[PDB]
Write an enzyme that holds these catalytic residues in place. Structure first.
Site, PDB file in Angstrom:
ATOM      1  N   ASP A   1      47.328  15.726  47.721  1.00  0.00           N
ATOM      2  CA  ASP A   1      46.141  16.394  48.619  1.00  0.00           C
ATOM      3  C   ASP A   1      46.572  16.021  49.911  1.00  0.00           C
ATOM      4  OD1 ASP A   1      43.859  17.472  49.447  1.00  0.00           O
ATOM      5  OD2 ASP A   1      42.371  15.890  48.545  1.00  0.00           O
TER       6      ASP A   1
ATOM      7  N   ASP B   1      45.906  22.182  53.710  1.00  0.00           N
ATOM      8  CA  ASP B   1      45.606  21.391  52.824  1.00  0.00           C
ATOM      9  C   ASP B   1      45.722  22.025  51.429  1.00  0.00           C
ATOM     10  OD1 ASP B   1      43.461  19.996  50.435  1.00  0.00           O
ATOM     11  OD2 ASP B   1      41.739  21.060  51.641  1.00  0.00           O
TER      12      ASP B   1
HETATM   13  C1  LIG Z   1      38.784  22.157  46.184  1.00  0.00           C
HETATM   14  C2  LIG Z   1      38.598  20.738  46.940  1.00  0.00           C
HETATM   15  O1  LIG Z   1      37.505  20.228  46.852  1.00  0.00           O
HETATM   16  N1  LIG Z   1      39.638  20.272  47.400  1.00  0.00           N
HETATM   17  C3  LIG Z   1      39.775  18.811  47.634  1.00  0.00           C
HETATM   18  C4  LIG Z   1      40.771  18.261  46.847  1.00  0.00           C
HETATM   19  C5  LIG Z   1      40.087  18.566  45.453  1.00  0.00           C
HETATM   20  C6  LIG Z   1      41.331  18.966  44.411  1.00  0.00           C
HETATM   21  C7  LIG Z   1      40.880  19.134  43.058  1.00  0.00           C
HETATM   22  F1  LIG Z   1      41.607  19.820  42.154  1.00  0.00           F
HETATM   23  C8  LIG Z   1      39.497  18.827  42.579  1.00  0.00           C
HETATM   24  C9  LIG Z   1      38.770  18.146  43.396  1.00  0.00           C
HETATM   25  F2  LIG Z   1      37.462  17.827  43.183  1.00  0.00           F
HETATM   26  C10 LIG Z   1      39.050  17.931  44.769  1.00  0.00           C
HETATM   27  C11 LIG Z   1      40.172  18.511  49.262  1.00  0.00           C
HETATM   28  O2  LIG Z   1      40.266  17.273  49.365  1.00  0.00           O
HETATM   29  C12 LIG Z   1      39.310  19.221  50.270  1.00  0.00           C
HETATM   30  C13 LIG Z   1      37.827  18.607  50.009  1.00  0.00           C
HETATM   31  O3  LIG Z   1      37.062  19.215  51.018  1.00  0.00           O
HETATM   32  C14 LIG Z   1      37.634  18.823  52.386  1.00  0.00           C
HETATM   33  O4  LIG Z   1      37.635  17.485  52.641  1.00  0.00           O
HETATM   34  C15 LIG Z   1      36.803  16.546  52.605  1.00  0.00           C
HETATM   35  C16 LIG Z   1      36.982  15.132  52.525  1.00  0.00           C
HETATM   36  C17 LIG Z   1      37.906  14.455  53.687  1.00  0.00           C
HETATM   37  C18 LIG Z   1      37.583  14.901  50.916  1.00  0.00           C
HETATM   38  C19 LIG Z   1      35.561  14.212  52.777  1.00  0.00           C
HETATM   39  C20 LIG Z   1      39.057  19.498  52.802  1.00  0.00           C
HETATM   40  C21 LIG Z   1      38.435  21.129  52.619  1.00  0.00           C
HETATM   41  N2  LIG Z   1      39.731  19.301  51.567  1.00  0.00           N
END
Ligand SMILES: CC(=O)N[C@@H](Cc1cc(F)cc(F)c1)[C@H](O)[C@H]1CO[C@@H](OCC(C)(C)C)[C@H](C)N1
Length: 389
Positions: A36, A232
């Site tokens: 990630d 991302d």
């Molecule tokens: C779909 C999503 O939430 N994606 C997640 C990963 C992830 C993958 C997965 F399969 C299951 C999850 F629950 C989580 C990413 O980290 C995102 C989270 O929000 C943002 O970041 C916010 C933070 C820095 C974490 C506080 C930024 C857009 N990156």
């Protein structure tokens, strides 16, 4: 190709995430970890969960260190609570080094673990600014570079299959590569074009122009980066600010107007199916994203195909039809260049030179008539004004 040991070390897909094999503790405990670039916390399941087949056992690790601190991370939909500690960590199909890194042992979670995903943890590859509880929690990549001779760079080749894969097919197939400490020249064709990292928090970039089949979207470029634009691998879709999303969908509908699709398809909720091998790729437009270049007043463009933004999904009837969901969605938190975008390109996260490189992927899905592209240079003025503040 000078990084043979790391080529083909990823598995997974855009919808459930791409993962790498890692080991934690002494003796080593093997876990599959989601790669990630949109977060900065290294965390693993550390208690039984109905969707976990294995988890980290702190009491079986002689090198485990308790940090005596709680940690919570809220994601887009999912979240977890856990306990901070440190341990020895290795990447079997990675550099031949072992590092001591921070690990959040997940004790409670809601909508985080995905049934059938095959991963038991998350490797947040972004910077300390967005780490939880705060920026004093050193992210895994920072520890790796500080403790070893590994260059401060990683590169990602995410390989979308272009057709559905069940849990068993995912396990058996190669999903891509994560080259730690270098750039493997066998993973791309053509030239690598670099965009600056605006600020070291998320992997933040600046989009200066958008086209749909060469037609300029003609929005103030600030709109494309409102309130930020990030790269991302942890988000599935290409996510666009509400105003940009509404203008892009109106343009994509007009370009594909020979066929009418229900509102639920455009909202990313319902699938559209076509008879085996007849998906009309040619009616759907290409999408170009122009990014700020490293040279003053210079830009370049990355171009994706419907083979990237139409996500393959299995039919509700599991028939011989070729089914897809529209992988572009609205956002109230800025642009997100997710896995469906990254699948078209070899992406170099050059932390040492504060820049992101893009090249056409050697594994991108295309047809005999069109390919994904990375081209430049373009003369583009007032690019720093596209940045939102
Ligand atoms: C779909 C999503 O939430 N994606 C997640 C990963 C992830 C993958 C997965 F399969 C299951 C999850 F629950 C989580 C990413 O980290 C995102 C989270 O929000 C943002 O970041 C916010 C933070 C820095 C974490 C506080 C930024 C857009 N990156």
């Amino acid at each position: 190709g000078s990084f043979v040991e790391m080529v083909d070390n990823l598995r997974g897909k855009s919808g459930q995430g791409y993962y790498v094999e890692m080991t934690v503790g002494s003796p080593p405990q093997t876990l599959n970890i989601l790669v990630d670039t949109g977060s900065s916390n290294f965390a693993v399941g550390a208690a039984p969960h109905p969707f976990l087949h294995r988890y980290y056992q702190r009491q079986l690790s002689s090198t485990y260190r308790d940090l005596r601190k709680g940690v919570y991370v809220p994601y887009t939909q999912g979240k977890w609570e856990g306990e901070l500690g440190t341990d020895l960590v290795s990447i079997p199909h990675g550099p031949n080094v072992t590092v001591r890194a921070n690990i959040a042992a997940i004790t409670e979670s809601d909508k985080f673990f995905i049934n059938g995903s095959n991963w038991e943890g998350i490797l947040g590859l972004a910077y300390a600014e967005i780490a939880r509880p705060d920026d004093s929690l050193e992210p895994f990549f920072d520890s790796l570079v500080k403790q070893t001779h590994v260059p401060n760079l990683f590169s990602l080749q995410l390989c979308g299959a272009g057709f559905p894969l069940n849990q068993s097919e995912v396990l058996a197939s190669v999903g891509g590569s994560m080259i730690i400490g270098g750039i493997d020249h066998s993973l791309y064709t053509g030239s690598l074009w670099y965009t600056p990292i605006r600020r070291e928090w998320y992997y933040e970039v600046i989009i200066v122009r958008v086209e749909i089949n060469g037609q300029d979207l003609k929005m103030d470029c600030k709109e494309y980066n409102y309130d930020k634009s990030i790269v991302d691998s942890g988000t599935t879709n290409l996510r666009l600010p509400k105003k940009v999303f509404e203008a892009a969908v109106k343009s994509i509908k007009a370009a594909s107007s020979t066929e009418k699709f229900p509102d639920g398809f455009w909202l990313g909720e319902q699938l559209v199916c076509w008879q085996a091998g007849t998906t009309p790729w040619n009616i759907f437009p290409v999408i170009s994203l122009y990014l700020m270049g490293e040279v003053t007043n210079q830009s370049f463009r990355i171009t994706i195909l419907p083979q990237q933004y139409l996500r393959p999904v299995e039919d509700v009837a599991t028939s011989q039809d070729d089914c897809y969901k529209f992988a572009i969605s609205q956002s109230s938190t800025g642009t997100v260049m997710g896995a469906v975008i990254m699948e078209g390109f070899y992406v170099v996260f050059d932390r040492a030179r504060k820049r992101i490189g893009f090249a056409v992927s050697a594994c991108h899905v295309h047809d005999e008539f069109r390919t994904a592209a990375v081209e430049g240079p373009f003369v583009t003025l007032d690019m720093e004004d596209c940045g939102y503040n």
